[PDB]
Amino acid sequence: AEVVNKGDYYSIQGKYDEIIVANKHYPLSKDYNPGENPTAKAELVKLIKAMQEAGFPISDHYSGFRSYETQTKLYQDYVNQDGKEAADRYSARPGYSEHQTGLAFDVIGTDGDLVTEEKAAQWLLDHAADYGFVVRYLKGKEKETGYMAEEWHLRYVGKEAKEIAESGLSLEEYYGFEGGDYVD
């Protein structure tokens, strides 16, 4: 399968499910505002509960859906200032964040910070797929995904997550769609 332009977004047909694509190559449209995906949200709750039961200090609170308009403001504040290059490196241009899909969620520690502690991060690599999630921005896959590695950013893909995690690949590499940096 190859990506299809469906106007509001590009998507690719996975083994079980349609997979919406949002990255630095394929933006979502300005008007695409699906809010939080309920299926993803219900698995996230379970994921968090299982982390907490394994003893990790993980908050119930998370960063989920973020609209184009909110991302616009957020990206503008970052160029404002840390400059446009720090914005591109650490923020995301509006339309180009997976958070606008409603399928991406950042897990947060009860210490108030995005999860970076090594054992919790590896739990996510090992187990996020049990809840249909993948760790999107893998270590070492910056050229493929376009994004600096993030231990805490999870993307809901559903049943195919286990095969994806076992491959060690980015979604770009796994499904065969384009990634990389902003073309500009």
We find the least distance from the C-beta atom of residue 83 to Zn ion, in angstroms, to be 21
Q: Which is nearer to Zn ion, 106 or 178 (CB)?
A: 106
Rounded to the nearest angstrom, the gap between the alpha carbon of residue 123 and the centroid of all alpha carbons in its chain is 17
We find the least distance from the C-beta atom of residue 4 to Zn ion, in angstroms, to be 14
Pairing type for strands 4-5 and 58-63 reads unpaired
End-to-end CA distance of the chain: 26
Q: How far apart are CA 10 and CA 60, in angstroms?
A: 31
Beta bridge partners of 63: 106
Q: How far apart are CA 104 and CA 116, in angstroms?
A: 17
Q: Which is nearer to Zn ion, 54 or 176 (CB)?
A: 54
Q: Point out which residues bind Zn ion (CB under 5 A).
A: 7-8, 29, 31, 106, 127, 130, 153
Q: Which is nearer to Zn ion, 7 or 38 (CB)?
A: 7
Q: Which is nearer to Zn ion, 115 or 176 (CB)?
A: 115
CB closest to Zn ion, residue no? 153
We find the least distance from the C-beta atom of residue 8 to Zn ion, in angstroms, to be 4
